[PDB]
Design a protein around this nucleic acid. Sequence first.
RNA 1: UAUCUGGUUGAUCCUGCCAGUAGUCAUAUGCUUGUCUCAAAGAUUAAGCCAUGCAUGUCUAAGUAUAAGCAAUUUAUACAGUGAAACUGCGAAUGGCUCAUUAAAUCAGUUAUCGUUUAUUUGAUAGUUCCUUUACUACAUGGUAUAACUGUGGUAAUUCUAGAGCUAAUACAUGCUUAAAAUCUCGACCCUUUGGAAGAGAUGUAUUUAUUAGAUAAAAAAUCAAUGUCUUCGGACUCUUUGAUGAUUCAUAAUAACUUUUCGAAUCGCAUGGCCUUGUGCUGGCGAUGGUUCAUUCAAAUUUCUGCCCUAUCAACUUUCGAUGGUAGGAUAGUGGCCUACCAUGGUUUCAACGGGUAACGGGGAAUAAGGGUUCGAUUCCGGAGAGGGAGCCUGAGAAACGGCUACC
RNA 2: GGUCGGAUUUCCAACGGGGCCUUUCCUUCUGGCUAACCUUGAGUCCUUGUGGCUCUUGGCGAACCAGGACUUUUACUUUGAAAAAAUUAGAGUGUUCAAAGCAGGCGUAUUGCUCGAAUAUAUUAGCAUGGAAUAAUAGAAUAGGACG
RNA 3: ACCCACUCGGCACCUUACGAGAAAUCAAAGUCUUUGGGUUCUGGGGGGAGUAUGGUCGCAAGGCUGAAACUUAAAGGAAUUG
RNA 4: CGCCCGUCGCUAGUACCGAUUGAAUGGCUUAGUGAGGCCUCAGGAUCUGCUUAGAGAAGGGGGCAACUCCAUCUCAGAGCGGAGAAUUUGGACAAACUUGGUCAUUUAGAGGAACUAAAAGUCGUAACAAGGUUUCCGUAGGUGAACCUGCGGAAGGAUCAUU
RNA 5: UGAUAGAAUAAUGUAGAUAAGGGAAGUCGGCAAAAUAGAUCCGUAACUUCGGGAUAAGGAUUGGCUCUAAGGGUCGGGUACGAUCAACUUAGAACUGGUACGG
Lengths: 188, 260, 155
Amino acid sequence: GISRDSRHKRSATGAKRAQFRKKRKFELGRQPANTKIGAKRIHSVRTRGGNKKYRALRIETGNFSWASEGISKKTRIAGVVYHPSNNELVRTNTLTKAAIVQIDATPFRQWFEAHYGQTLGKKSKNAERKWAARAASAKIESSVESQFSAGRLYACISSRPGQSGRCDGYILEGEELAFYLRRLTAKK
Amino acid sequence: ARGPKKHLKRLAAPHHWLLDKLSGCYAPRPSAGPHKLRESLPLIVFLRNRLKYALNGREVKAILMQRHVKVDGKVRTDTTYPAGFMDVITLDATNENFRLVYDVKGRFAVHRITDEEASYKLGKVKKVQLGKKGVPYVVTHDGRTIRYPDPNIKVNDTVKIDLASGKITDFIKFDAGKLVYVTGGRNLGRIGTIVHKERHDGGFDLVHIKDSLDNTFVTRLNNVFVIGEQGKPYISLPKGKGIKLSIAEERDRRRAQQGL
Amino acid sequence: STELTVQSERAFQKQPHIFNNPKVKTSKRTKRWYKNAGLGFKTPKTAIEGSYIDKKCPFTGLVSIRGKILTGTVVSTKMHRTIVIRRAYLHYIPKYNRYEKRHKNVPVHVSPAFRVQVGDIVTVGQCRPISKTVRFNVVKVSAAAGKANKQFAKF
RNA sequence: UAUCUGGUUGAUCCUGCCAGUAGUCAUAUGCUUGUCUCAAAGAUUAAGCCAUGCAUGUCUAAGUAUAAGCAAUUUAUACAGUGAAACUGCGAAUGGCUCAUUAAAUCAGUUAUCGUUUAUUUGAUAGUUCCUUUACUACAUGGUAUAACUGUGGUAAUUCUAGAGCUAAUACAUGCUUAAAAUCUCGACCCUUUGGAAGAGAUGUAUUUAUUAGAUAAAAAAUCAAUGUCUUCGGACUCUUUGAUGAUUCAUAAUAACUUUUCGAAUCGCAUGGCCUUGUGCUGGCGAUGGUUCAUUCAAAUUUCUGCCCUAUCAACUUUCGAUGGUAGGAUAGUGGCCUACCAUGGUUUCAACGGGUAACGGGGAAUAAGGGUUCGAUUCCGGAGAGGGAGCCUGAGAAACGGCUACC
RNA sequence: GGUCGGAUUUCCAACGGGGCCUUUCCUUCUGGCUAACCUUGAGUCCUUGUGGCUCUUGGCGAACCAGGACUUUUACUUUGAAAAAAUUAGAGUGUUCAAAGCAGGCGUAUUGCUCGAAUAUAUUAGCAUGGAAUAAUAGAAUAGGACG
RNA sequence: ACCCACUCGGCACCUUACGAGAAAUCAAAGUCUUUGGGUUCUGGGGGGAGUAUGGUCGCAAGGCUGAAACUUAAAGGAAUUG
RNA sequence: CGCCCGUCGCUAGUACCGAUUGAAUGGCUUAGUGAGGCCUCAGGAUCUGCUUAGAGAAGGGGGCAACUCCAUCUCAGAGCGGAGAAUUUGGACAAACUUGGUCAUUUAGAGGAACUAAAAGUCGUAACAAGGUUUCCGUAGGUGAACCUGCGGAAGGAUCAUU
RNA sequence: UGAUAGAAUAAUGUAGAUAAGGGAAGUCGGCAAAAUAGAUCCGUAACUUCGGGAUAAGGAUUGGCUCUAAGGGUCGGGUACGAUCAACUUAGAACUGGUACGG
Ligand SMILES: [Mg+2]
Ligand SMILES: [Mg+2]
Ligand SMILES: [Mg+2]
Ligand SMILES: [Mg+2]
Ligand SMILES: [Mg+2]
Ligand SMILES: [Mg+2]
Ligand SMILES: [Mg+2]
Ligand SMILES: [Mg+2]
Ligand SMILES: [Mg+2]
Ligand SMILES: [Mg+2]
Ligand SMILES: [Mg+2]
Ligand SMILES: [Mg+2]
Ligand SMILES: [Mg+2]
Ligand SMILES: [Mg+2]
Ligand SMILES: [Mg+2]
Ligand SMILES: [Mg+2]
Ligand SMILES: [Mg+2]
Ligand SMILES: [Mg+2]
Ligand SMILES: [Mg+2]
Ligand SMILES: [Mg+2]
Ligand SMILES: [Mg+2]
Ligand SMILES: [Mg+2]
Ligand SMILES: [Mg+2]
Ligand SMILES: [Mg+2]
Ligand SMILES: [Mg+2]
Ligand SMILES: [Mg+2]
Ligand SMILES: [Mg+2]
Ligand SMILES: [Mg+2]
Ligand SMILES: [Mg+2]
Ligand SMILES: [Mg+2]
Ligand SMILES: [Mg+2]
Ligand SMILES: [Mg+2]
Ligand SMILES: [Mg+2]
Ligand SMILES: [Mg+2]
Ligand SMILES: [Mg+2]
Ligand SMILES: [Mg+2]
Ligand SMILES: [Mg+2]
Ligand SMILES: [Mg+2]
């Protein structure tokens, strides 16, 4: 099938290499997952040495990390808004690695309000003492808190769904967030 | 191709097995095991070709299936079991104990040891690493994984293994002046003391070794196996002690002790 | 590479798994990972205090140097972050007891920590396959003077 | 084993070939052929085509025995011996053959994997199995569903199978039962605060992501968010755990989560010892077979440098349908234009690129040879390729397998 | 020639390696070497010699380990290593000889003893190492030079 | 301008044969089996044949590059006697 | 009375040119059609599990008169879920065929024009002697043929020679 | 909005068309008709007066819709620069339909 070797290519001098042997299984490649959004569907792959791979086909949610807060939450993925490799992946809402998406802001806001008592956007003694000890830490960033009003945080996929069956990622902060904001994720 | 090879053609076996050219298309292909294929000695080669206790493979299998032989204290009914350097071979019948040490011609010698020597072996530390749960362990030259090693133990050192319990009794560092045994290359079987060790960062540390008669040679570190301090090895050396006589003096003693 | 469009591509360029915390404002705003490739090769200050990314850099990238260390002459700096060096050698033909001049062209990745011009003698170190043809990174340059100090306009 | 002779002339000396001369694990053929030892042998031409038969199966004390099998058996009325068949497991990817493809390709020597996969061998390794525990499920042991077999058939024909009735597992799914605290999370209960505590939950191993530690050069301090555990309450404080590599975002560890949740023994042989609340109670040996992960062994894949015959009546070639590099992604066991999107205009070459030829598989080697050389190497070993030609794929640790399948010719 | 023309040895000669001095790099700073002890408090008990001494007067602690204010490059040659086995050359061995093969040999054959299965060559490339003639290359000239 | 003596460079010549060559002859055609100063081109028995073919140049004539099948015991050089 | 050249002529052989859009085989390949498995969007014969689930009648225990609880033989049918064949959408891989293109090797061919061998054929005598016009070189024209002629060149000439 | 009108719809005509299978067998002769056709991309031989031959030959594509990317003008400085205006060309992608599209 798909052959992943270099014999079919031209040589560095441009010469047309002749056929050396038949295609081998140990040099194969598979069809892309083209992971979509919705109604989780994962097919296993038998790979070399056993070693199951998990093809993500149209899965719903994922695990996303707030690195400044050092927490990770299961969160639904809304859509793809940017992709550095192909704008058609944005168009078709295809989930690969490095695709910029919006997710929920919702479990992250409950965690933040339970951890600081601040109400991002606009009762116990133990809770109060914990919040006081965590004070001088609630101010995160205007460009992140702005997203919480719309209930959609910008996050980058750090997992390969077509290899692992997971849409994991991290919220954008700082210069990475500003880069994608200036680039395309503004302008609605 | 397409998978692992199961046959070893005669003329492709290790030369130090001293198998005859004719009388067979094949050679015993050593099983997977503690020692590498080229550096091993299959039990059939030891029992048949070296010790002459068996006339053919069928007798080797007959001996092994009654659980007479044992390598490092375990029966090893396998005919092609890859016994190698510093393996202890015990025959409960004949009350015989052997350690596999090369003679000075780069071949495994039929070397006899006592019960107290057969109680232990030596292993060259191939690697030192932290395993899961952060538990340190050493790996020896015979594939033994030994957990909780002494922290002073590094790579190229030698450990004494209890061989009843897989435990280190003591160890020897790799330093100049320590007795070593050459386990590879063209100087295989020679014994001497480390003069010094030149690093060559990025590849192939070298070791300078001189024997009893001040003959020096240089060998790659991979072939160097520490076996004791200055003199007094921790193992019983075979006859010759790795001196490497020249052919002229070899011939001189041939004609000396052949004419009484 | 503090300037000249580090972020010049559709994806944000960064060193993987190196985290700049937006909260704790240490007076540099940039955590730059680096390593010493080893074998006595000094890490350039341009790599240390730069801002380029170059995942294929042997000092700031993921690649590692292991294998052959070769020297050559830069014959082409036209590709982006890749040079071609010319390795000349004498090949001995036994029948005539004589040699013939022979050369090889090696494509080498060059880190933006290094400035190389056609004619510079370069030390390159083997790494894993970077490209179809590239199997080396520049680890050293030897352009000291260039013999261009007395080839200018004279009053 | 550093050797030459005949032939142009009327004769001569040269050049110069023709001829002779000697070998050939160098083929064929002719004549001849008594002995012993050794022993190549459908390579060349046709990797042309094949009748037939054989060349891959395998069972130990130790997976499944109600054969309506034989012997009949060691309490042996659950079984116990042997044991067809058939499930299960392993093997069939080795070997063996051939040299058609193949000219930096194969391959040789030498590197690398800090760029990966690895059944088996060997060594090491698993008290954590609790949906959201203040909704625990037989563990003296979960469940059905099938083969062989019974019986009824179809087809000229096949190592074709259908319908119905049974029944196992180390097959196939499910499913519990084992210290001890510690450290974190949450939280009813602290009155002028350098004011702490009942009580629940989590913490095995794999998966995926994010984040953190993984240190290190020999001397000291004065104030400043820093009375954050500074004891004559300003009596100048007993400090630094941390491995390896030439080198790492390495080994490993930590935190928050995640998962069509992986594994964490519902298995088998032999012996059946010890003990006291003598209950057919509690403990208990030597093995077998499984199983996670890491090492190892066997490898595999890719990979660094240099090296290949004739040809210019082959001088430019590659770049449209990747050529050369960059970024990102996808795919892969993994690196890499391997592929995709975007981008740049590169890459090789008179030091012979590109193309053409080969009555080319490469090497170890072989013949001959004073020395240097010349010719050969299909062929006993190593590597590679293929099984009429292509392509594709299933099972598997491993095959793009052909005494496997699918399709086309 | 005191063993019926054969050890021994500054009587030395001839080759071959190393160190030092003569204007003489062998770069380098961190620290454990504690000099073939620069400098002989206490001691020359051998009938005379320039071939054999003890806790040493802070004693250039320069007699090796792992990091540079640390690196001109190259050819060539030396040694080492690597270059599978078979094969080639070749050591041993009466396969009855020989081609071969890797065997075998010796007793006390009464209860087994013992030698082997060497060695060389294997070209180029790569690797480590000594050399520094030969042949290239580089250096301080608008000094942007070195020493410190 | 001429004479003489030197000197560098040049066209040549004469004698001799050190030396070379098969010889004719040659101061280079020498310093070659006592075989190596540097470097370019060309030849490998006589014919077929500088033919055929392809390419390239040329208006053309033609030039440059340039085989093979086949055939053949000589062709040839220098000298000697007639 | 040597040697020797060419045309023409018979025999044979070798290739060459050659109308025939010649022919044959093989390699690569543009386009078109496109088997097959694999991935994927679907599809859902059957083949099944829990909670159930309702009716027609039985057994057993209970006010014992009807009445009531659990069990069974029958079948819909539905909330439920899993498995799942035929079939099937779109992809990459891509055999294979058709036509066309191109490269390679081999090959038929009327006729034409060469070469060679083959002994004694016909015509002349071009060369070797000053070969009877000295030979030869390049170029051009001409002629049955060897060849002749012009222009420049060479001596390998028949002259090393006229202070 | 002119050209005599109305009715009917035989044959033969004139002009225009269509045709199963075959495909020039027709005929002096492919006469007549048919086939081709725009544009974009690819590919293009002999021969040649080197200018051509050439649209040689030969082959793909073409609608709609929804997008994307390029190509422009004026207004502006310190005795790290943006408003705003406007045009039709080219290229690419998704989707879509009785595979239709120079209709
Ligand atoms: Mg993966
Ligand atoms: Mg095989
Ligand atoms: Mg000859
Ligand atoms: Mg006889
Ligand atoms: Mg054949
Ligand atoms: Mg054969
Ligand atoms: Mg067979
Ligand atoms: Mg198998
Ligand atoms: Mg055969
Ligand atoms: Mg296996
Ligand atoms: Mg078993
Ligand atoms: Mg790339
Ligand atoms: Mg990549
Ligand atoms: Mg061939
Ligand atoms: Mg060969
Ligand atoms: Mg061969
Ligand atoms: Mg052949
Ligand atoms: Mg094959
Ligand atoms: Mg065949
Ligand atoms: Mg196959
Ligand atoms: Mg077969
Ligand atoms: Mg087979
Ligand atoms: Mg002999
Ligand atoms: Mg002159
Ligand atoms: Mg010749
Ligand atoms: Mg000739
Ligand atoms: Mg004349
Ligand atoms: Mg005449
Ligand atoms: Mg005349
Ligand atoms: Mg002549
Ligand atoms: Mg009208
Ligand atoms: Mg018709
Ligand atoms: Mg028709
Ligand atoms: Mg007609
Ligand atoms: Mg007619
Ligand atoms: Mg017409
Ligand atoms: Mg035309
Ligand atoms: Mg056309």
